[PDB]
């Protein structure tokens, strides 16, 4: 459709705040803006966009955009130097795929430990001390921890802490063959989560809404969530704190750092109207304020608004957890990686598969060219292969032959 903007954003984000930005754009230019939050839009978008349909603008963390760019569903964004300087260079690095900007970064988001100050004034510095806190709280008819166990994003900080990793960063690229989903570190992390479930400290059936209800109702002492969750805790009568995630085996929990990005559909006929709305309306102090007022964005990409929000202890806590963590790869392999870790976490938590069997299957499911770690009489050995080389570099070196006149 032409003459109107269709925007897709996740339901856990500030969509009503973004709709206010759409009503401002409609009163200024006369172009109607429709903000939608469909379920599983990360899966929906590549299906609708392939046929040439779907939204004009897509809002998701940078990690899914690399595959969307590879499939040719995204338009190349080409902003001016004056505009590029208004946003942090590392935020632009997250939205860069094959030397091309494929989306507009909006906000840097990381998981933090959200604790109830009345129930727990001093939050645990380690994961290992949580079962002891659970005994104390259970006596008071409460529980220690409750977080989303259906989404690997929330369990990844624990898997990464002792040594787990998605893809290794070698030279100036990600090694799409080097997956650390079945290493000792990943195994120790998932074993600990499974032990919390087996010992009734946590329930395998816990999702986002179940954990959010329990924290906001004051039933659970702690939760693991991002900046977007702060607004609902504010409306509830909870004296909460946002702090560093607890350490595992003396090492910091490494959450996956996401950059909320807005891409433009390649099939969209309103590419200039999308650029106008995103640059001059959304990525402004007033524009970003509207979205943040509904549901907090985190550390915004716009330098001017970030400076005003930096003084917030909750955003200061998000950045500390972001620094200890890692920016997600935007590479196309990320989708396959996430599906493999989701399956492993669920099957290990339910008791369907052992931790070893779940992470071993996840390892070889994550990248197609990935290795496999085996337990031998001499120790742990990584099995790998090479020789089917298929890529073709971005730059080609070839000697020019003369065509005689």
């Amino acid at each position: 459709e032409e003459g109107k903007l269709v925007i897709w954003i996740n339901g856990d984000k500030g969509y009503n705040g973004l709709a206010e930005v759409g009503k401002k754009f409609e009163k200024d230019t006369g172009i109607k803006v429709t903000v939608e939050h469909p379920d599983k839009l990360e899966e929906k978008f590549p299906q609708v966009a392939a046929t040439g349909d779907g939204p004009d603008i897509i809002f998701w963390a940078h990690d899914r955009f690399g595959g969307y760019a590879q499939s040719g569903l995204l338009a190349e964004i080409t902003p001016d130097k004056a505009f590029q300087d208004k946003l942090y260079p590392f935020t632009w690095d997250a939205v860069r795929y094959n030397g091309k900007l494929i989306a507009y970064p909006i906000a840097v988001e990381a998981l933090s430990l959200i604790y109830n100050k009345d129930l727990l004034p001093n939050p645990p510095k380690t994961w290992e001390e949580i079962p002891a806190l659970d005994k104390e709280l259970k006596a008071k008819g409460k529980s220690a921890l409750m977080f989303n166990l259906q989404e690997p994003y929330f369990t990844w900080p624990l898997i990464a802490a002792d040594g787990g990793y998605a893809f290794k960063y070698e030279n100036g690229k990600y090694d799409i063959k080097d997956v650390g989903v079945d290493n000792a570190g990943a195994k120790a992390g998932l074993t600990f989560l499974v032990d919390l479930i087996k010992n009734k400290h946590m329930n395998a059936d816990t999702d986002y809404s179940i954990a959010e209800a329990a924290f906001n109702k004051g039933e659970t002492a702690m939760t693991i969530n991002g900046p977007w969750a702060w607004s609902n805790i504010d409306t509830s009568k909870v004296n909460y704190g946002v702090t560093v995630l607890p350490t595992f085996k003396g090492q910091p929990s490494k959450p996956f750092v996401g950059v909320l990005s807005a891409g433009i559909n390649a099939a969209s006929p309103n590419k200039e109207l999308a650029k106008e709305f995103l640059e001059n309306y959304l990525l402004t102090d007033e524009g970003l304020e509207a979205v943040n007022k509904d549901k907090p964005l985190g550390a915004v990409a716009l330098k001017s608004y970030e400076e005003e929000l930096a003084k917030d202890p909750r955003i200061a806590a998000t950045m500390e957890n972001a620094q200890k963590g890692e920016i997600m790869p935007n590479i196309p392999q990320m989708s396959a990686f996430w599906y493999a870790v989701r399956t492993a976490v669920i099957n290990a938590a339910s008791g369907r598969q052992t931790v070893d069997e779940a992470l071993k299957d996840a390892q070889t499911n994550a990248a197609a060219g990935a290795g496999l770690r085996v337990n031998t009489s001499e120790g742990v050995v990584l099995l790998s292969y090479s020789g089917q080389k298929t890529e073709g570099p971005q730059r080609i070196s070839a000697k020019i032959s003369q065509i005689p006149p």
Partner: protein, 422 residues
């Protein structure tokens, strides 16, 4: 009686690698012949014999009393139908032979076919049958609008193409773009496979260039790089040729067997032309009626066609075998599996048979056959590679090789690695 390959025999092969390779170079499409007409496959399918195994086999046969005629590899080529007669290729002396008179009739109702190359030694000893890659049958080149939906008929950035020129008035009816002695020329006998790379409209001329992905459309800037020598022609603009005129106002996707024109980027209406065996430039005269059309001779009118390559490598690991070495297996990809009790390696490819075993160096693996495209094997324990003086816990790299029950060794370009971890 057939002998199974021994570890000693495997160790010797891995050190020498005296392989016998058979290469089939052909076009991905073929135009149908109607009535009693014969529309020959262009460029002519080529059969190359590579590897030091051929000389080794000749010398072995001649120690058995063979004459040079008896030890000489012979080859015949045809399409996958018995109704058409198989044509002889003359390898004798040369390392290759091109099949200049192959065609597919209207009677042959197949939508896709493979070329069948029947090889044997002059003394009638059978080598085997080697098939090409799939060739799609086309009625005529698409004279109208093309789309990415017909991807089989479209040309993608970074893929190999052959460029030929039809010259009706000239003695040599058809010439082919080829590179000989580090120079581009219009060969009457040989043809080159060129990677057609797409580049951004702002990319300047130079030895180093950034290649963009996607299907090649007319008006776009392309770099033609030789798949053998790595030699590239200067930045060209691929344009649609109509009768004897190159049209500048074309944006349509470039399709199979289309009439081409290659204007040199940032030049005074100069295009890629041919003067006998040599390739030169040509000054285009713009039409006074249409400012979007330019006059170009027959030598400036080229024909684009996507090309493929079939490769088969074998070696008689336990000496001469009674049975032919074919169908020669080809390994496309590998994948490890941790879903089961023990670590498994899944092989994907073609021509797999129950009588094969995967070998990791000189270590024969427990192999499970599923189908001609899928085989599984039990990855050997690292201890299998710690047998002698190599007992120290260290990284181990070994080749992956397919072996037949009669000792025939099928080489692979893939290696396997065991990496100890703390």
């Amino acid at each position: 009686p057939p002998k199974r390959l021994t570890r000693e025999a495997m160790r010797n092969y891995l050190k020498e690698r005296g392989d016998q390779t058979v290469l089939i170079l052909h076009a991905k499409v073929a135009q149908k012949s109607y009535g009693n007409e014969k529309r020959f496959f262009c460029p002519p399918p080529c059969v190359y014999l590579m590897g030091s195994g051929w000389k080794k086999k000749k010398e072995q046969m001649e120690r058995d009393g063979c004459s040079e005629q008896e030890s000489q590899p012979c080859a015949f080529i045809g399409i996958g139908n018995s109704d058409q007669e198989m044509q002889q290729l003359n390898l004798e002396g040369k390392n290759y032979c091109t099949a200049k008179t192959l065609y597919i009739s209207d009677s042959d109702k197949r939508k896709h076919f493979m070329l069948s190359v029947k090889m044997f030694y002059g003394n009638s000893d059978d080598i085997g049958v080697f098939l090409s890659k799939r060739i799609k049958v086309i009625s005529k080149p698409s004279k109208k609008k093309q789309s990415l939906k017909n991807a089989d008929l479209c040309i993608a950035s970074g893929t190999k193409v052959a460029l030929f020129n039809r010259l009706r008035s000239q003695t040599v009816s058809t010439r082919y773009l080829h590179v000989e002695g580090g120079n581009f020329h219009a060969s009457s006998q040989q043809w080159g496979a060129f990677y057609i790379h797409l580049l951004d409209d702002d990319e300047s001329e130079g030895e180093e260039f950034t290649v963009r992905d996607g299907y090649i459309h007319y008006g776009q800037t392309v770099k033609l790089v030789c798949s053998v020598t790595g030699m590239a022609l200067p930045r060209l603009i691929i344009r649609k040729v109509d009768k004897q005129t190159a049209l500048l106002d074309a944006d349509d996707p470039v399709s199979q067997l289309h009439k081409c024109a290659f204007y040199l980027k940032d030049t005074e209406r100069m295009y890629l032309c041919l003067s006998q065996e040599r390739i030169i430039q040509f000054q285009a005269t713009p039409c006074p009626k249409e400012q979007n059309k330019e006059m170009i001779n027959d030598g400036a009118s080229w024909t684009i066609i996507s090309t493929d390559k079939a490769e088969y490598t074998f070696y008689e690991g336990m000496g001469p075998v009674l049975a032919p070495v074919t169908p020669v297996p080809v390994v496309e990809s590998l994948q490890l599996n941790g879903g089961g009790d023990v670590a498994m390696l899944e092989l994907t490819g073609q021509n797999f048979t129950p009588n094969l075993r995967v070998w990791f160096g000189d270590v024969e693996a427990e192999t499970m056959y599923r189908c001609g495209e899928s085989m599984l094997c039990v990855v050997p324990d690292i201890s299998a590679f710690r047998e002698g003086w190599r007992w120290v816990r260290q990284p181990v790299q070994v080749p992956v090789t397919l072996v037949r029950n009669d000792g025939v060794i099928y080489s692979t370009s893939l290696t396997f690695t065991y990496t100890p971890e703390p």
